[PDB]
Design an enzyme around this catalytic site. Structure first.
Site, PDB file in Angstrom:
ATOM      1  N   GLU A   1     -21.181  43.254 -25.490  1.00 20.43           N
ATOM      2  CA  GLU A   1     -21.971  41.779 -24.985  1.00 20.43           C
ATOM      3  C   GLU A   1     -21.801  40.791 -26.157  1.00 20.43           C
ATOM      4  OE1 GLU A   1     -23.212  41.329 -22.529  1.00 20.43           O
ATOM      5  OE2 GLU A   1     -23.968  43.408 -21.639  1.00 20.43           O
TER       6      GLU A   1
ATOM      7  N   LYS B   1     -24.660  48.509 -17.931  1.00 18.35           N
ATOM      8  CA  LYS B   1     -25.737  49.187 -18.875  1.00 18.35           C
ATOM      9  C   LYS B   1     -26.254  50.476 -18.377  1.00 18.35           C
ATOM     10  CE  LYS B   1     -26.914  44.623 -20.788  1.00 18.35           C
ATOM     11  NZ  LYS B   1     -27.486  43.404 -20.376  1.00 18.35           N
TER      12      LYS B   1
ATOM     13  N   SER C   1     -25.939  39.730 -13.885  1.00 18.88           N
ATOM     14  CA  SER C   1     -25.487  38.248 -13.827  1.00 18.88           C
ATOM     15  C   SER C   1     -24.561  37.898 -15.146  1.00 18.88           C
ATOM     16  CB  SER C   1     -26.500  37.351 -13.939  1.00 18.88           C
ATOM     17  OG  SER C   1     -27.262  37.270 -15.135  1.00 18.88           O
TER      18      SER C   1
ATOM     19  N   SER D   1     -24.157  42.922 -16.324  1.00 15.90           N
ATOM     20  CA  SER D   1     -25.378  44.209 -16.853  1.00 15.90           C
ATOM     21  C   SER D   1     -25.236  45.404 -16.139  1.00 15.90           C
ATOM     22  CB  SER D   1     -26.526  43.618 -17.023  1.00 15.90           C
ATOM     23  OG  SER D   1     -26.307  42.534 -18.233  1.00 15.90           O
TER      24      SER D   1
ATOM     25  N   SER E   1     -32.523  44.127 -19.235  1.00 19.84           N
ATOM     26  CA  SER E   1     -31.226  43.819 -19.444  1.00 19.84           C
ATOM     27  C   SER E   1     -30.777  43.465 -20.941  1.00 19.84           C
ATOM     28  CB  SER E   1     -30.761  42.753 -18.443  1.00 19.84           C
ATOM     29  OG  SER E   1     -29.506  43.030 -18.100  1.00 19.84           O
TER      30      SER E   1
HETATM   31  B1  LIG Z   1     -26.421  41.195 -17.520  1.00 15.75           B
HETATM   32  O1  LIG Z   1     -25.701  40.778 -16.548  1.00 15.75           O
HETATM   33  O2  LIG Z   1     -28.077  40.780 -17.312  1.00 15.75           O
HETATM   34  C1  LIG Z   1     -28.514  39.480 -18.197  1.00 15.75           C
HETATM   35  C2  LIG Z   1     -27.541  39.630 -19.264  1.00 15.75           C
HETATM   36  C3  LIG Z   1     -27.270  38.326 -19.559  1.00 15.75           C
HETATM   37  O3  LIG Z   1     -26.003  38.049 -20.617  1.00 15.75           O
HETATM   38  O4  LIG Z   1     -26.357  40.385 -19.110  1.00 15.75           O
END
Ligand SMILES: *[B@@]1([O])O[C][C]([C][O])O1
Length: 261
Positions: A139, A46, A210, A43, A103
């Site tokens: 995602e 993002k 994560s 993430s 997130s």
């Molecule tokens: B990112 O890494 O932060 C939470 C989401 C879980 O898929 O992705």
């Protein structure tokens, strides 16, 4: 140096692979640990998607207020904010905030779509001088974090430089940069990561990540009180696909960095 010896010891104690990059904007000095190795971004990617949309809004001045419909088919595995707006709309600003501060994975996918796919996110990175970042998937599959897989990776050095440019530099317009900084400062997922290893008086803006392989990441801009800001990227991944998250490692790495200044 002392700091590199302590980061190596931290890594050895953790069982995983740690990547750190610190930029001290006071003197543009850099501290790197596995700084040119690839790590899965998860993430932390993002930030690039949100910034790409902010860049678009410099020309499309009302873009951030554009409503985007959230449909049940849009929901993926982790959608804390989008879930609250199923069968309704969210603006691009709200989606950007949700992707960054919670997130939200649905929000990220809407940002990717707005940019014309993962290639549009990558293109923005290239446009601001980041030759290393690559976003390949949407995602949730961009979090697979498979050892050796170059998809959806960057290096600590590259991400630190890019985060510096986006937040402290002028890769974005003035209003856009300020918006990004505001969003990062308002992150809700970072309390146990870099922030936990820093003085409580320092202001932090960060984005966590994560993923599988126990991948545990955080990228931050840090404003110490009476001191030039710092940019700190901490990436961590582990050899077991089902490994547990290790936010404590990122906190410890930040603590080690903070002690060295
Ligand atoms: B990112 O890494 O932060 C939470 C989401 C879980 O898929 O992705």
């Amino acid at each position: 140096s002392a700091v590199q010896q302590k980061l190596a010891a931290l890594e050895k104690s953790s069982g995983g692979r740690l990547g750190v990059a610190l930029i001290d904007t006071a003197d543009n000095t850099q501290v790197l640990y596995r700084g040119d190795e690839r790590f899965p971004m998860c993430s932390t990617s993002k930030v690039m998607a949100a910034a790409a949309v902010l860049k678009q809004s410099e020309t499309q001045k009302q873009l951030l207020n554009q409503p985007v419909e959230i449909k049940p088919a849009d929901l993926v595995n982790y959608n804390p904010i989008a879930e609250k707006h199923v069968n309704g709309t969210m603006t691009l600003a709200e989606l950007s905030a949700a992707a960054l501060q919670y997130s939200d994975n649905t929000a990220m996918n809407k940002l990717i779509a707005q940019l014309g796919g993962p290639g549009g996110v990558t293109a923005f990175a290239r446009a601001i001088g980041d030759e290393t970042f690559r976003l390949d998937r949407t995602e949730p599959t961009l979090n697979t974090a498979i050892p050796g897989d170059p998809r959806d990776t960057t290096t600590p050095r590259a991400m630190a430089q890019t985060l510096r440019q986006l937040t402290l530099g002028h890769a974005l317009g003035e209003t856009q940069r300020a918006q990004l900084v505001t969003w990062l400062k308002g992150n809700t997922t970072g309390a146990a990561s870099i922030r936990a290893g820093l003085p409580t008086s320092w202001t932090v803006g960060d984005k966590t990540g994560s993923g599988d392989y126990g991948t545990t990441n955080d990228i931050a801009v840090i404003w110490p009180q009476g001191r030039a800001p710092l940019v700190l990227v901490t990436y961590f991944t582990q050899p077991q696909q089902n490994a547990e998250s290790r936010r404590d490692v990122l906190a410890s790495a930040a603590r080690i960095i903070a002690e060295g200044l």
